[PDB]
Design an enzyme around this catalytic site. Structure first.
Site, mmCIF file in Angstrom:
data_model
loop_
_atom_site.group_PDB
_atom_site.id
_atom_site.type_symbol
_atom_site.label_atom_id
_atom_site.label_comp_id
_atom_site.label_asym_id
_atom_site.label_seq_id
_atom_site.Cartn_x
_atom_site.Cartn_y
_atom_site.Cartn_z
ATOM 1 N N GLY A 16 -6.558 -31.343 -9.272
ATOM 2 C CA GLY A 16 -7.965 -31.281 -9.629
ATOM 3 C C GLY A 16 -8.176 -31.796 -11.021
ATOM 4 N N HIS A 19 -13.953 -32.551 -16.831
ATOM 5 C CA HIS A 19 -14.376 -33.392 -17.929
ATOM 6 C C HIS A 19 -13.322 -33.513 -19.032
ATOM 7 C CE1 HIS A 19 -18.426 -35.002 -19.244
ATOM 8 N NE2 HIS A 19 -18.375 -35.227 -17.921
ATOM 9 N N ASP A 135 -18.005 -19.620 -13.684
ATOM 10 C CA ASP A 135 -17.796 -20.802 -12.826
ATOM 11 C C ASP A 135 -17.289 -20.386 -11.468
ATOM 12 O OD1 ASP A 135 -17.836 -23.668 -12.325
ATOM 13 O OD2 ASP A 135 -15.793 -23.929 -13.135
HETATM 14 N N1 LIG Z 1 -9.492 -29.158 -16.212
HETATM 15 C C1 LIG Z 1 -9.458 -29.136 -15.057
HETATM 16 C C2 LIG Z 1 -9.398 -29.100 -13.629
HETATM 17 C C3 LIG Z 1 -10.682 -28.901 -12.848
HETATM 18 C C4 LIG Z 1 -9.697 -27.754 -12.970
HETATM 19 C C5 LIG Z 1 -8.885 -27.440 -11.751
HETATM 20 O O1 LIG Z 1 -8.358 -28.322 -11.081
HETATM 21 N N2 LIG Z 1 -8.777 -26.097 -11.416
HETATM 22 C C6 LIG Z 1 -8.143 -25.697 -10.205
HETATM 23 C C7 LIG Z 1 -8.934 -24.932 -9.146
HETATM 24 C C8 LIG Z 1 -8.436 -26.337 -8.857
HETATM 25 C C9 LIG Z 1 -7.121 -26.470 -8.117
HETATM 26 N N3 LIG Z 1 -6.119 -25.790 -8.977
HETATM 27 C C10 LIG Z 1 -4.923 -25.358 -8.450
HETATM 28 N N4 LIG Z 1 -4.649 -25.808 -7.176
HETATM 29 C C11 LIG Z 1 -3.525 -25.291 -6.583
HETATM 30 N N5 LIG Z 1 -3.230 -25.674 -5.284
HETATM 31 C C12 LIG Z 1 -3.784 -26.792 -4.657
HETATM 32 C C13 LIG Z 1 -3.190 -27.397 -3.490
HETATM 33 N N6 LIG Z 1 -3.935 -28.458 -3.090
HETATM 34 N N7 LIG Z 1 -4.963 -28.546 -3.979
HETATM 35 C C14 LIG Z 1 -6.013 -29.561 -3.816
HETATM 36 C C15 LIG Z 1 -7.152 -29.047 -2.906
HETATM 37 O O2 LIG Z 1 -7.872 -28.027 -3.519
HETATM 38 C C16 LIG Z 1 -4.930 -27.534 -4.945
HETATM 39 N N8 LIG Z 1 -2.641 -24.358 -7.132
HETATM 40 C C17 LIG Z 1 -2.906 -24.014 -8.403
HETATM 41 C C18 LIG Z 1 -4.004 -24.503 -9.125
HETATM 42 F F1 LIG Z 1 -4.149 -24.160 -10.398
HETATM 43 C C19 LIG Z 1 -6.667 -25.316 -10.271
#
Ligand SMILES: N#C[C@@H]1C[C@H]1C(=O)N[C@@]12C[C@@H]1CN(c1nc(Nc3cnn(CCO)c3)ncc1F)C2
Length: 290
Positions: A16, A19, A135
């Site tokens: 993910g 900004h 958020d």
């Molecule tokens: N700065 C900045 C950035 C925008 C903030 C960000 O990406 N925060 C987050 C909530 C998203 C995903 N993420 C996390 N995602 C996962 N798992 C996972 C497996 N597939 N995917 C993609 C389909 O969702 C994600 N494990 C831990 C995490 F921490 C943390």
């Protein structure tokens, strides 16, 4: 306190981005053999200013003090010499966000309410530690397995000042206005009850299976229109004050829609707290599970 040695960090994929940051999946393999651990590493962009850099150090500290089954596991930090800060190392939540997962997997009403309950447990815990999330949306709720959900991001989380009931915000272009209560948009104040409003919006997302055509920005922008200059937020504020709300999702029971509407009370004091929601959701889940 745990330190990650950047020499064992191999980037797999982006998870993910925002900004001023990015979250990436890494294999942390201090060998090369099959004892490898998968980790989510959040990094602040090198070009980020002082306001964002101070907020970053506060975010890292917030995740360190948080430990709950429905909150993402802090794993450690490592020196980000490229960005001259620290990289937040967290556990890898395997099924990703509900925003990504729900449009592809038709999930039963029962599992949806279980997630709703789990989000409330994680949120009542966050509010007990005197923090506001700011958020809460389906993009920030991660799926570990079909019966386990975790709040997976705290980029906007703030401590609520001691002798105060809210935090004063100072609205930016990154503010998730379509998940915000009128008091945030109008008076620039974020209460514990302001998160309960955002939970109502997250519950609406889950019940629409995070379908883009039904999303809060899509639905609200249809109501406001697009030729409104700098007035999207003002129009949003006034439609909410007339009592207009996101619609009842297809196949959403009337009781759950009423609960959504109760999280969306214009008067913040009329909204249930997350502690009030837990026995209510427990009961509505048992009902549908049976
Ligand atoms: N700065 C900045 C950035 C925008 C903030 C960000 O990406 N925060 C987050 C909530 C998203 C995903 N993420 C996390 N995602 C996962 N798992 C996972 C497996 N597939 N995917 C993609 C389909 O969702 C994600 N494990 C831990 C995490 F921490 C943390």
């Amino acid at each position: 306190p745990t330190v990650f040695h950047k020499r064992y960090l191999k980037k797999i994929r982006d998870l993910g981005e925002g900004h001023f940051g990015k979250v990436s999946l890494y294999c942390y393999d201090p060998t090369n053999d099959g004892t490898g651990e998968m980790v989510a590493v959040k990094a602040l962009k090198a070009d980020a200013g002082p306001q964002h850099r101070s907020g970053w150090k506060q975010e890292i500290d917030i995740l360190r003090t948080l430990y709950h089954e429905h909150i993402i596991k802090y794993k450690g930090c490592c020196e980000d010499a490229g960005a001259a800060s620290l990289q937040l190392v967290m556990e890898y939540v395997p099924l990703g966000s509900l925003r990504d997962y729900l449009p592809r997997h038709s999930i039963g009403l029962a599992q949806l309410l279980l997630f709703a309950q789990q989000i409330c447990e994680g949120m009542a815990y966050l509010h007990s530690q005197h923090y506001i999330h700011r958020d809460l949306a389906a993009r920030n709720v991660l799926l570990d397995n079909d019966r386990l959900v975790k709040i997976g991001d705290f980029g906007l989380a703030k401590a609520v000042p001691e002798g105060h009931e809210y935090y004063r915000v100072r609205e930016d272009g990154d503010s998730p206005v379509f998940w915000y209560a009128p008091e945030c948009l109008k008076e620039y104040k974020f209460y514990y009850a302001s998160d309960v409003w955002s939970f109502g919006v997250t519950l609406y997302e889950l019940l629409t299976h995070c379908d883009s055509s039904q999303s809060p920005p899509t639905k609200f922008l249809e109501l406001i229109g697009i030729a409104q200059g700098q007035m999207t937020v003002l129009r949003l504020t006034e439609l909410l004050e007339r009592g207009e709300r996101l619609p009842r999702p297809d196949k959403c029971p009337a009781e759950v829609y009423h609960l959504m509407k109760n999280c969306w009370e214009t008067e913040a004091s009329f909204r249930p707290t997350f502690e009030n929601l837990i026995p209510i959701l427990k009961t509505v889940h048992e009902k549908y599970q049976g």
